[PDB]
Ligand binder design. Structure first.
Ligand code: MOO
Ligand code: MOO
Ligand code: MOO
Lengths: 88, 87, 84
């Protein structure tokens, strides 16, 4: 039920983890946005494939402060349990 | 305070959070609650004009949920809440 | 940098601190939106000069419930963007 995404660009320190968690919550998703050591943001989100598809669209095109260069889709077959959408 | 019963595809789709967010942005207090039948019950406290704005939002604001119908229940409840709860 | 904005108008009890803090967090800012005894709201924000200009733009013209009359630019690590 979870898909992981790797987001690159000017994406740290620009409200991206916060806004991502907000959008995820508005979509009824659970999961996290995490700063990675290399400057990217890792997003894991859990729910329906359609919801995850909208989230992936938003990550690419949604109004946001960050400047997204690439949104890479990793596994879509992750089996995780999250209570909310945490910033990590 | 007013009470609204929202029916449709409204659970598991971020409706209570999005509602709480719209309420807080309007300075309203109250709650969005999942009902066992699949409805969501919304109580909001504020000026009549702000509660109408929440009503417009419930009906037509861009959201994930598919709202079938927004039922206007009582509008003269006298409650006190601190924030806007997701219940 | 940090900046302080004294916002006046119908700005209390109208979701102004919540929305302002939401807007700051979406911008990557830290600081607070504080109700003042006199009815003003005092917004302090810390981040890049560019991101602070974006907050100011929002305070003055951003869609919101509050009816802002004036936004005072004044001089000024916070964790998050606190309501009060
Ligand atoms: O600058 Mo953030 O990505 O909400 O911690
Ligand atoms: O998918 Mo929700 O935002 O607790 O109703
Ligand atoms: O309704 Mo407000 O966002 O506590 O200043």
């Amino acid at each position: 039920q979870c898909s992981k995404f790797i987001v690159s660009g000017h994406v740290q320190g620009v409200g991206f983890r916060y806004h991502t968690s907000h959008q995820g919550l508005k979509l009824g998703l659970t999961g996290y946005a995490k700063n990675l050591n290399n400057g990217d943001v890792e997003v894991v989100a859990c729910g329906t494939p359609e919801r995850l598809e909208e989230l992936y669209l938003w990550l690419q095109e949604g109004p946001k402060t960050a400047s997204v260069r690439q949104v890479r889709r990793l596994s879509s077959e992750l089996e995780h349990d999250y209570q909310g959408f945490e910033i990590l």
